[PDB]
Design an enzyme around this catalytic site. Structure first.
Site, short mmCIF file in Angstrom:
data_model
loop_
_atom_site.label_atom_id
_atom_site.label_comp_id
_atom_site.label_asym_id
_atom_site.label_seq_id
_atom_site.Cartn_x
_atom_site.Cartn_y
_atom_site.Cartn_z
N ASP A 281 0.81 -1.22 0.00
CA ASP A 281 0.00 0.00 0.00
C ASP A 281 0.84 1.26 0.00
O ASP A 281 0.28 2.36 0.02
CB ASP A 281 -0.97 0.03 1.19
CG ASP A 281 -0.26 0.17 2.54
OD1 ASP A 281 0.98 0.00 2.62
OD2 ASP A 281 -0.97 0.44 3.53
N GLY B 197 6.46 1.49 2.39
CA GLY B 197 7.24 1.09 1.24
C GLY B 197 7.40 2.22 0.23
O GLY B 197 6.63 3.17 0.20
N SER C 54 7.66 -11.99 14.87
CA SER C 54 8.54 -11.05 15.56
C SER C 54 8.89 -11.56 16.94
O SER C 54 8.08 -12.21 17.61
CB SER C 54 7.89 -9.66 15.66
OG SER C 54 8.60 -8.82 16.55
N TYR D 11 0.43 -4.79 18.09
CA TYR D 11 1.29 -5.32 17.04
C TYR D 11 1.79 -6.72 17.40
O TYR D 11 1.71 -7.65 16.59
CB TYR D 11 2.48 -4.38 16.79
CG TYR D 11 3.61 -5.01 15.99
CD1 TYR D 11 3.62 -4.93 14.60
CD2 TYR D 11 4.66 -5.67 16.62
CE1 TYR D 11 4.65 -5.50 13.86
CE2 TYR D 11 5.70 -6.24 15.88
CZ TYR D 11 5.69 -6.16 14.51
OH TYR D 11 6.71 -6.73 13.78
N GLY E 30 10.11 0.37 29.85
CA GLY E 30 9.83 -0.98 29.37
C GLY E 30 10.91 -1.58 28.49
O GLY E 30 10.79 -2.75 28.12
N1 LIG Z 1 13.72 -5.64 12.71
C1 LIG Z 1 12.70 -5.54 11.83
O1 LIG Z 1 12.75 -4.77 10.88
C2 LIG Z 1 11.52 -6.42 12.03
C3 LIG Z 1 11.39 -7.14 13.24
C4 LIG Z 1 10.29 -7.97 13.42
C5 LIG Z 1 9.35 -8.09 12.41
N2 LIG Z 1 9.47 -7.41 11.28
C6 LIG Z 1 8.41 -7.62 10.28
O2 LIG Z 1 9.02 -7.74 9.01
C7 LIG Z 1 8.14 -7.27 7.96
C8 LIG Z 1 8.86 -6.18 7.13
O3 LIG Z 1 9.13 -5.09 8.00
P1 LIG Z 1 10.14 -3.96 7.45
O4 LIG Z 1 11.28 -3.75 8.46
O5 LIG Z 1 10.68 -4.30 6.05
O6 LIG Z 1 9.28 -2.64 7.50
P2 LIG Z 1 8.61 -1.83 6.28
O7 LIG Z 1 7.64 -0.80 6.81
O8 LIG Z 1 9.73 -1.18 5.50
O9 LIG Z 1 7.97 -2.92 5.30
C9 LIG Z 1 6.59 -3.16 5.58
C10 LIG Z 1 5.89 -3.06 4.23
O10 LIG Z 1 4.49 -3.41 4.30
C11 LIG Z 1 3.71 -2.43 3.63
N3 LIG Z 1 2.36 -2.40 4.21
C12 LIG Z 1 1.99 -1.96 5.45
N4 LIG Z 1 0.70 -2.07 5.67
C13 LIG Z 1 0.19 -2.62 4.53
C14 LIG Z 1 -1.11 -2.99 4.11
N5 LIG Z 1 -2.22 -2.84 4.92
N6 LIG Z 1 -1.23 -3.52 2.90
C15 LIG Z 1 -0.17 -3.66 2.12
N7 LIG Z 1 1.09 -3.35 2.37
C16 LIG Z 1 1.22 -2.83 3.60
C17 LIG Z 1 4.49 -1.12 3.85
O11 LIG Z 1 4.18 -0.15 2.86
C18 LIG Z 1 5.96 -1.62 3.69
O12 LIG Z 1 6.33 -1.69 2.32
C19 LIG Z 1 6.91 -6.70 8.72
O13 LIG Z 1 5.89 -7.70 8.81
C20 LIG Z 1 7.46 -6.42 10.14
O14 LIG Z 1 6.41 -6.45 11.12
C21 LIG Z 1 10.51 -6.59 11.06
#
Ligand SMILES: NC(=O)c1ccc[n+]([C@@H]2O[C@H](COP(=O)([O-])OP(=O)(O)OC[C@H]3O[C@@H](n4cnc5c(N)ncnc54)[C@H](O)[C@@H]3O)[C@@H](O)[C@H]2O)c1
Ligand SMILES: NC(=O)c1ccc[n+]([C@@H]2O[C@H](COP(=O)([O-])OP(=O)(O)OC[C@H]3O[C@@H](n4cnc5c(N)ncnc54)[C@H](O)[C@@H]3O)[C@@H](O)[C@H]2O)c1
Ligand SMILES: CC(=O)N[C@H]1[C@@H](OP(=O)(O)OP(=O)(O)OC[C@H]2O[C@@H](n3ccc(=O)[nH]c3=O)[C@H](O)[C@@H]2O)O[C@H](CO)[C@@H](O)[C@@H]1O
Ligand SMILES: CC(=O)N[C@H]1[C@@H](OP(=O)(O)OP(=O)(O)OC[C@H]2O[C@@H](n3ccc(=O)[nH]c3=O)[C@H](O)[C@@H]2O)O[C@H](CO)[C@@H](O)[C@@H]1O
Lengths: 308, 307
Positions: free
Chosen positions: B32, B36, B118, B143, B272
């Site tokens: 969305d 991103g 996570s 979350y 926390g």
């Molecule tokens: N250390 C970390 O970065 C970390 C830790 C634990 C979990 N995660 C999980 O890893 C995944 C990627 O996270 P990230 O670090 O790349 O963050 P990010 O925000 O860069 O990537 C998340 C992506 O999902 C898209 N998105 C969000 N809501 C949406 C929706 N309703 N419909 C469609 N697209 C949607 C965003 O535009 C983005 O491109 C996520 O599920 C996040 O919860 C990341």
């Protein structure tokens, strides 16, 4: 006089709670979509009762429903676990979104106390054959069980973040009058009692050695009222089981004896999702609540049968 | 052969998209663009197809999974704090999207889905201990509760409908394209951006806190393996290295990389905040081919050179 909002108040457990609250002098407001609840379960003539027919996941409805309320008992849910397996998307609205939307409305309205009907289903098969303590690792196996557990997690979030006072109760197997026996997945006591009253055969799935911790609804109602009136309820969950052991064969013999009529027992296969042994560790319950002398299985079956 | 990547325009997703296209897959991105960026993606690559919309949109998911052989479900609102401020909206992205995906995959007959869970599902449990996958759960925010509920629903669809989920609990991922614009951005993206710009950093606490940092390229290799393994395990796998880096270690490594000493303003420890966080990654070592992961200094140098 104080007003209690009871979601799902037109149902089995809810309508008994409503009777008890009204009798204690509370005003009561029921929010129920009448999916399985029934207006005939409620004492509609009681001047202290208000009824709102609608969806407990409806934010606009909750904003109206909480106005002028002092505390909440959140019983609305689709109680049939099998219904959640059939339609995860629809039941997730009733089994979790309703909890989330209620938390939002209570926080806005400034209402702290909510008593929540969680379920022994959150344990899944873990601890089977032993008294299940509340800190047993969770293993929800259906959308219903996962939504009840998720509901707990969100209630705890609103407790820490927004000062909600949740009273989380994990019901084991509740039975008694007004439990609807119309489904093959109705509670086994409601089914068996209906057939025995009618003089028709029952069907036993498996060998009958499965055990449940049955709780008569009147004893559950005592706990629910106490959770409403507690000065500072514990943050973590409390099992509502007696720690008792009843096999289905125990139940068959007790019911047959109470009905005074012969009882034909036809067989079916064990159902695929059937947990064999289920018993609560009652220690937190006994520490936190005054159960007095609960109804034994025989006393509870007798009251159920004598009402039909 | 085509892979759906929800959230493919984000930090982790866009690196995955690069790797999958490099390996010859066709890649469909559903994003969305809330966080991103189209600039994260190799637009103009003939194998890349971008769909823009809500991963919770049933009608859109039905189109999105059609013709796909497997799914990597990364779409979520990654900001824990955003879920605290808006539980209702973030639950759509952080759980409902998972449930709708399960339904769309079942209807289309697609089994394999790699899911980004996570370490937040553990809450403060296992502070000071190597966190194993059976560490008791205590999700503290919407979350975290939604990530855990996603896992439980994924397991139900596996047992009830033959789905093949690959559940991965990420610890602290870092690398190029990680957004440093928010105060709750990952500490490495913030500290590195400030080091490159020669601006002061703020240390919350004494800097003795430790984290199990994982360079994004190593995570991507695991994500791809999750797609290609022939019989993945049913339960979750921690993705961490079992590494121990203090924040003071990190500041020292950045000062050595930037060549200039960092000015360190002292802030109070965050409420926390977990002091010591470390994965027990035995399951990862057993189930995946880890090779030699990048060290922190390697990852930091690769990140810093990209800024
Ligand atoms: N250390 C970390 O970065 C970390 C830790 C634990 C979990 N995660 C999980 O890893 C995944 C990627 O996270 P990230 O670090 O790349 O963050 P990010 O925000 O860069 O990537 C998340 C992506 O999902 C898209 N998105 C969000 N809501 C949406 C929706 N309703 N419909 C469609 N697209 C949607 C965003 O535009 C983005 O491109 C996520 O599920 C996040 O919860 C990341
Ligand atoms: N009876 C048990 O053994 C048992 C065990 C564990 C948990 N519970 C829980 O206890 C509570 C009461 O269950 P019950 O046994 O009295 O069954 P019930 O079906 O009689 O009560 C459920 C009530 O909630 C109402 N309801 C359902 N969806 C609704 C919605 N979206 N909006 C408003 N009202 C809605 C129904 O109309 C009904 O009145 C439920 O939360 C159930 O999950 C019961
Ligand atoms: C909450 O689910 P839980 O299984 O605990 O409760 P239920 O009342 O639905 O079932 C209890 C037991 O009785 C059995 N049972 C149920 C209905 C029936 O007609 N015959 C029968 O033998 C079930 O398979 C189960 O073993
Ligand atoms: C995911 O949460 P997690 O805490 O694991 O990860 P974060 O990257 O958000 O923060 C890690 C640590 O760095 C600290 N931190 C973070 C950002 C900053 O500018 N300064 C700082 O000292 C945090 O307080 C925390 O102790």
């Amino acid at each position: 006089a104080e007003r209690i909002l009871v979601t799902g108040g037109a149902g089995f457990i809810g309508s008994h709670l409503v009777d008890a609250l009204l009798a204690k002098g509370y005003a009561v407001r029921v929010l129920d979509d009448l999916s399985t609840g029934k207006v005939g379960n409620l004492p509609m003539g009681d001047a202290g009762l208000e009824l709102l027919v609608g969806d407990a996941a409806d934010a606009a409805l909750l904003a109206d429903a909480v106005q002028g309320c002092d505390a909440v008992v959140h019983l609305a849910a689709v109680a049939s676990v099998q219904a959640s397996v059939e339609d995860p998307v629809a039941t997730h609205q009733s089994n979790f979104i309703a909890t989330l939307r209620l938390c939002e409305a209570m926080t806005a309205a400034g209402i702290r106390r909510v008593v929540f009907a969680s379920s022994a289903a959150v344990y899944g098969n873990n601890g089977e054959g032993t008294p299940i303590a509340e800190d047993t690792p969770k293993s929800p196996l259906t959308p219903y069980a996962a939504d009840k557990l998720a509901s707990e997690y969100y209630l705890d979030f609103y407790r820490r973040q927004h000062g909600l006072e949740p009273v989380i109760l994990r019901f084991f197997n509740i039975f008694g009058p007004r439990q609807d026996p119309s489904s093959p997945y109705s509670g086994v006591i409601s089914i068996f009692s209906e057939r025995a009253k009618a003089g028709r055969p029952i069907t036993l799935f498996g060998d009958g050695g499965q055990t449940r911790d049955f709780v008569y609804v009147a004893d559950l109602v005592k706990i629910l009222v106490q959770g409403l009136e507690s000065p500072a309820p514990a943050a973590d969950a409390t099992n509502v089981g007696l720690g008792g052991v009843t096999t289905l064969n125990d139940l068959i013999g007790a019911l047959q004896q109470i009905s005074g009529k012969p009882l034909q027992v036809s067989h079916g296969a064990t159902r695929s999702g059937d947990i064999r042994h289920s018993k609560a560790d009652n220690r937190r319950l006994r520490e936190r609540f005054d159960l007095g002398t609960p109804s034994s299985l025989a006393e509870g079956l007798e009251r159920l049968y004598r009402s039909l």
